[PDB]
Paper text:
Functionally, the pilus is involved in mating pair formation (MPF), linking donors and recipients at a distance. Structures of mating or conjugation pili from the IncF and IncW incompatibility plasmids have revealed that the pilins polymerize into a helical arrangement with tightly bound phospholipid molecules, forming thin, tubular filaments ~8 nanometers in diameter that can extend several micrometers in length. Conjugation pilins are composed of three α helices, α1-3.
In IncF plasmids, MPF has been shown to enable low efficiency DNA transfer via the hollow conjugation pilus.
Numbering used by the authors:
A (entry chain A), B (entry chain A), C (entry chain A), D (entry chain A), E (entry chain A), F (entry chain A), ...: 6 to 70
Write the structure that this text describes.
């Protein structure tokens, strides 16, 4: 008797591991990092996209959708 | 002579430990954390999904539904 | 010559220490706290369910139903 | 020559210090306070049942039934 | 010798668990919630249809028509 | 003996899943979001139309008209 | 038996993909961005008109008017 | 059946490519840059008017008024 | 044998699609919107006359006078 | 057989495009904007009289008095 | 048949281009600017009276009283 | 028919070129500059009273009271 | 054959342009404005007596007593 | 034939230019300003009594009692 | 014929130049200044009691009670 | 006829020159200064208690309680 | 021939300057002010009893009983 | 001939200087201040009980019961 | 003739010097201070429980319950 | 007659010296210190867990639960 069971499918494909939103977030990270590195010359901005990637992976395994 | 005993079943499966609402809350946490980390570069946002998980567990054992 | 003595039983089992209404109130507290913590990142919301629990206990001993 | 002297007994046991109505009023106070605290997070609602209790005591000593 | 026994049938099918009025009430809830969420951006409006559903169920079991 | 059975058809096509009112609500959401994003520059307004869409779907399956 | 079918045409041409309101919103974005960049010298304001454009496109395909 | 078609002309000549407001914005940029360069001696302020100019051009071609 | 058939003509020209009352209502809307926008500076008042117009159209087609 | 046709003339000259009320509204806008700019130093108040002007024009063409 | 034509004269001399209210507004601007410059040492306050002057001029030509 | 013409005299002598308020503002500038120079040893504070003086002069000629 | 012609004189001097009632209304406005300005510090109260004056003038010319 | 001419004298001396009420209003202004300045340290409160004084003067000349 | 002339005496001695309320206000200023200086180490708080004193003097001469 | 004359005594001994509150303020100053000097090694913190002392003296002579 | 002259004495001592009712009103004012100040921390409540006192005095001199 | 003289005694001992109500008000002040100081860390809450005490004293001397 | 004398006992033991509420307030202070010190590293939070303790003592001696 | 005596036990074991919350606070301190030391290389972060420990001890002895 679960009254919100009908939506998982949609959610899983719009906000999920294989979805467009996630790729847009990672693309934004790349561009922000490049623009900041040009202005400050600080190496901490060259790792940005890596730490996010691993993070997202570890996250989606805890939800189990 | 308990007059609201008939509903527990439904409640327990719609708002419970094994329910879709809880997974949607945790998914929202992941996405909010990623978007905030991209804009501020602050590490406090990388722990978000963990502290929530433990919290929910400790909560559902106190209700005992 | 008490004219409302016949109802205590029912009341005590519908609005009492061992009743479904109380568990629904505590469950609502858990869910509200999680949703608020996700949006504000403020630790005051992680204690909610504890303070309510003790409160209810201290209350039901003063009524003595 | 008091023409309403016959009823005190009944009144004293239905609307009195040791009566069911008073316990139902205090129980309602507990429940209202918990539900309001969950929605507002304001501490003024955690004192409700105390101030009522003392109040009722001081009242019943002035009537002297 | 029950003088209003003839009507239950009609009532049970016009104002009952399986009736059109109940579905119209739940539909109104959905639409009101969507319109309010668009104007305020407050999440309390996304739960509306669930709490009503459970409520109606628990109600119709107490009447026993 | 259901006395309001004659109207479902009309209702289902005027206030339903495939109806004009729903599309006008979603269009209003798009426009409100764009105007607010221009003035505040806050990303929470870029998700508006998605969360509403899923919501409506999950709603219309619970009514079953 | 749809009772509001007569208006779509008008709506689609006044609040639509090819309408004047949308162009006025995008023009406002350009001007706000220029005035803010002059006062703060922050590059985040140089992307404004792009993100809005894509957004509107993705929106109008979900409504399907 | 476009109900706001009558205004484009006026808008296009008051808030447009060939309008006085745009020239006042660029003039303000020149003056702000000179005053800031005098106080800080930083070369980033000598490019201000160029980047704005190109920006406005690219903007007005996307609106197509 | 319709006993009120003689009046439609008059009604249709005094309270109708092409009548003076409707234009006075729309004129009042324009003036109220301008006066409110001057005092609050809120954009919701700039759409008033549009939503009314479409509304009236959709209405007069349902009456069919 | 239009029973309110006699008044348009008067209305059109008292509440119209060429009327004193409209000029008083625009004058009030100028003065309010100046007084607010003096106290806050915010540029949004320097555009007030323009947006109103265009608005009124677009309005009076939809009424067609 | 203009019913408010009798007042323009008075208005034009009390709230107009050559009126005392306007001079009091500009005087207030001068004094506010001096007091703020003394406390912050920020040059943006030295232009205040100029931008207001031009503004008022451009305004009074659009009203045409 | 100017309805606020009676006050200029008073205003001109209380908030004017030859008034006490202006001298108090300039005196405050002197004292603030001395106290700041003692703590920072920065020469920009030794010009304060000059730039204000010229400013006030140029201001009072634009008001023409 | 006008049956109420005898009273105009009296009316015109008791409720008229040159009458005591009007001066008492304007005096009340002055006092209310001062008391409100002292408590709120809002400038809208400093214009009160002006707008009323013009209003009364424009009114008495429309009656023509 | 003015029927309320007998009272002006009294009014003019109780609610007038030379009356006690006006002095009490100005005294209240002084005290409110001092108490607010002590708590906020904002200079806008040091001008209060001046602006009121001029205001009252300009008011009493328009009434002409 | 002044109807509130009887109270000046009392007022003048309770809310006046030589009254206890004024001394309590100045004492509060001293204490607030000391406590704030201890926490911030900012010299603007060492002048507080002086500026208030002069202010009160200049005020009481304008009321003339 | 001074209506608040009865309290001076109490005030003068609780908030006065010879009172405990003043000594607690000076003690707090000593402790804050020592803790700050330990962390920054800046000599400006070694004068704190002196400047406060003189200040309080000069203050209490202006109140004259 | 005054037909109600016999009662003044009684009235003057029950509702008068030296009567118990007046003291009860002033006592109520004190208590209300204290309770409100405790809950809001707003200084306007500390003046209550003073303004009432003067008021009553000025009132009883106008009646002359 | 004072008709309410019989009650002063009772009033004076229930609502008076030496009464329980006053002590309960002061106790409430202490507790409210402590709870607020814990949450905000603002020193204004540490003076609460003092200012009330003096206030009550000054009040009871004006009533003279 | 004190009508609320019967309650002091209860009050004195529930809201008093030796009561559980006071210990819960001090415990809350300890926990809040520790959590804040962990996040900010500011020493002002290490004194919290001391200043409250003394405060409560000084308070309970002024009430004298 | 202590009305909240029933809860101490629970409180003492959930918020106490031997409780899980305290250990979680100290664990958080360790982790925050390590992460900060890695990024800044400042030795002040290596003492964190010690100062907290002593603090908590000294606190729990003052409450005496
Ligand atoms: C729906 C369409 C999505 C389209 C995705 C394309 C994204 C392209 C973004 C490129 C922007 C580059 C701008 C930039 O680098 O400026 C630097 C600023 C730094 O500002 P700050 O650190 O000084 O406060 O950086 C910032 O502060 C933030 C600016 C960038 C944030 C906006 C992008 C958010 C999109 C996230 C999508 C969420 C979808 C639900
Ligand atoms: C029923 C369908 C549920 C679908 C669940 C999908 C959720 C996907 C959400 C992704 C949104 C990402 C937006 C974002 O990151 O923006 C950042 C903002 C921060 O705003 P602020 O901190 O500046 O005030 O973040 C915010 O402030 C909050 C924005 C996100 C909150 C909306 C999500 C709430 C859904 C909870 C479901 C409750 C169900 C009863
Ligand atoms: C009879 C069936 C009971 C079913 C119980 C299931 C409860 C599940 C509730 C989950 C709701 C989550 C919504 C949420 O978190 O939104 C946050 C808002 C906060 O609003 P605000 O602070 O901005 O004013 O939060 C709020 O403001 C309040 C929203 C939640 C209140 C509704 C729940 C009340 C049920 C209490 C039952 C009483 C029974 C007599
Ligand atoms: C004879 C049988 C008695 C049974 C007693 C059981 C009582 C259980 C009550 C639980 C109700 C909880 C509902 C609740 O908390 O909602 C909050 C509202 C607040 O409304 P508002 O503040 O926004 O106006 O709260 C309210 O506004 C008031 C709602 C509660 C009032 C109804 C209870 C009155 C019973 C009193 C008995 C009198 C007997 C003569
Ligand atoms: C017999 C045919 C039934 C047809 C059912 C279709 C229902 C469709 C309703 C859609 C209406 C949407 C309007 C809306 O969302 O406006 C918001 C307002 C909120 O007003 P407020 O909160 O500001 O006071 O919302 C409101 O305040 C209430 C407006 C909606 C209430 C009217 C619907 C009641 C129908 C119930 C049927 C009962 C049958 C016995
Ligand atoms: C029947 C014809 C329907 C036609 C549909 C076209 C809708 C087009 C709407 C475009 C309006 C844009 C205005 C806007 O963005 O202003 C922002 C405001 C925000 O106000 P606030 O947040 O500051 O209180 O936003 C608001 O607060 C709300 C303003 C918009 C609400 C009005 C639209 C409601 C239509 C819903 C239709 C219901 C049908 C039953
Ligand atoms: C119907 C005729 C439409 C005419 C369209 C022409 C638009 C031209 C607008 C140019 C305004 C430039 C002003 C400006 O840049 O000031 C900056 C402010 C920023 O304020 P803030 O960030 O400090 O709160 O910016 C703001 O905060 C917002 C100010 C701009 C908002 C007003 C424009 C809204 C028009 C939207 C049309 C909706 C139609 C339904
Ligand atoms: C309608 C008439 C328009 C007249 C146009 C003439 C503009 C002349 C402006 C010259 C101002 C020079 C002042 C200056 O350089 O000071 C520097 C400050 C920097 O402040 P900050 O960086 O320290 O926060 O700079 C600033 O922070 C901003 C100060 C300048 C902003 C005001 C100009 C805005 C006019 C835009 C017109 C919009 C029309 C809708
Ligand atoms: C026949 C003799 C006439 C004597 C004329 C002398 C008038 C002197 C009036 C001075 C009253 C000042 C009181 C005041 O300022 O209080 C403010 C209140 C505001 O109340 P609110 O806004 O909070 O609802 O303000 C108000 O709300 C209204 C209070 C004032 C209204 C009473 C005056 C009406 C007289 C009009 C004469 C009509 C003759 C037919
Ligand atoms: C008939 C006898 C008249 C006696 C005149 C003596 C007046 C002495 C008044 C001194 C009061 C000082 C109180 C004070 O400064 O508190 C500040 C508050 C501010 O409140 P807020 O801004 O936070 O809403 O300030 C306020 O909000 C308003 C409080 C003061 C208003 C009351 C005085 C009104 C008297 C006007 C006389 C009218 C006669 C018709
Ligand atoms: C009738 C008896 C009068 C007794 C007079 C003795 C006054 C002694 C006051 C000493 C209080 C010291 C408290 C203090 O310094 O705290 C600082 C706060 C600053 O708060 P903030 O700036 O952070 O908002 O400071 C504040 O924000 C304000 C706190 C002080 C305000 C209360 C004193 C008002 C009394 C005025 C008397 C008016 C009589 C009508
Ligand atoms: C009623 C009992 C009074 C007991 C008096 C004993 C006072 C002992 C205080 C010792 C505290 C030492 C703490 C310390 O030095 O920390 C440094 C901080 C500096 O903070 P910041 O500069 O980084 O913002 O310093 C601060 O920022 C401020 C912290 C100290 C302020 C609290 C003391 C105020 C008491 C004043 C009494 C007023 C009575 C009405
Ligand atoms: C004949 C015996 C008289 C005995 C006199 C003793 C009076 C003692 C009164 C103490 C009551 C304290 C209660 C209190 O402070 O509560 C605050 C409320 C405020 O309510 P609100 O502002 O939120 O609407 O305050 C109020 O709203 C009003 C509550 C107080 C009003 C009742 C007192 C009226 C007595 C007047 C005597 C008239 C005799 C003809
Ligand atoms: C007859 C028996 C009397 C018993 C007296 C014992 C009193 C004990 C009270 C302890 C309550 C502590 C609660 C507290 O501190 O919460 C803080 C709130 C602040 O709320 P806010 O500022 O956010 O609106 O604080 C408040 O807003 C107000 C809450 C406290 C007010 C209730 C106490 C009133 C009793 C007055 C007695 C009057 C007798 C006629
Ligand atoms: C009846 C049972 C009582 C049980 C007592 C146990 C208390 C344990 C409390 C531990 C809470 C720790 C939470 C915490 O430290 O979070 C920090 C926040 C700071 O918030 P902010 O400064 O950012 O606005 O801190 C806060 O802002 C406030 C959060 C803590 C306030 C809630 C505790 C109040 C209880 C008082 C009892 C009154 C009884 C009448
Ligand atoms: C109920 C389950 C509890 C689980 C306990 C496990 C705690 C593990 C925490 C590890 C987090 C490490 C994150 C970190 O080091 O980031 C550094 C930031 C510094 O931020 P800032 O200084 O730049 O403002 O650090 C911060 O600013 C603060 C981030 C850490 C604060 C969150 C932990 C609070 C838990 C307290 C429990 C209270 C229970 C009532």
């Amino acid at each position: 008797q679960d009254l919100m069971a009908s939506g998982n499918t949609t959610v899983k494909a719009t906000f999920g591991k294989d979805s467009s939103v996630v790729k847009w977030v990672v693309l934004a990270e790349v561009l922000v990092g490049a623009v900041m590195y040009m202005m400050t010359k600080n190496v901490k901005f060259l790792a940005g996209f890596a730490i996010i990637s691993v993070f997202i992976a570890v996250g989606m395994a805890v939800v189990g959708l």
